[PDB]
Design a protein around this ligand. Structure first.
Ligand SMILES: [Cl-]
Ligand code: NA
Length: 150
């Protein structure tokens, strides 16, 4: 349904993710998440990580895809991951204000998640003809293109 402690959540996880962009140890992030024992807010981690990476270096975005692959199956499930991308698609209109190419970059995050097997290959299809948001559509379309040339 609805997540709890969202505002505090962002305040607590942001420094942890930013630090990860520098040390590159996904196990450090995993330990912090085990300490927090997050409820449904588990799905909020990928969204925040992606959101911060969008405004960072291209290397941070690659490190983020790696983090998602590592965390899935350890501190969160594919179900949490799918919920995270659903949230990401919804936040796209706001994210694009700071990063115009956010849709395309989210497209790569989606393609990579499907490649790493943490996001079902039918995820994109399910949204085919169910999305009104042109930004979400652009992200899904970019993901489709990237997966065709995989
Ligand atoms: Cl393209
Ligand atoms: Na990934």
């Amino acid at each position: 349904g609805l997540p709890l402690d969202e505002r505090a959540f962002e305040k607590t996880l942001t420094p942890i993710i930013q630090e990860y962009f520098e040390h590159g140890d996904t196990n450090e992030v995993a330990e912090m998440l085990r300490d927090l024992n997050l409820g449904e807010m588990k799905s909020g981690v990928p969204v925040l990580a992606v959101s911060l990476a969008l405004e960072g270096k291209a290397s941070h975005r690659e490190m983020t895809s790696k983090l998602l692959s590592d965390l899935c199956g350890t501190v969160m499930s594919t179900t949490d991951v799918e919920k995270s991308f659903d949230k990401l698609l919804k936040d796209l209109p706001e994210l694009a204000l700071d990063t115009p190419r956010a849709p395309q970059l989210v497209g790569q995050f989606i393609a990579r998640a499907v490649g790493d097997g943490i996001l079902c290959n039918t995820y994109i299809d399910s949204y085919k003809g169910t999305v009104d948001c042109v930004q979400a559509r652009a992200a899904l379309d970019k993901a489709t293109v990237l997966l065709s040339m995989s």
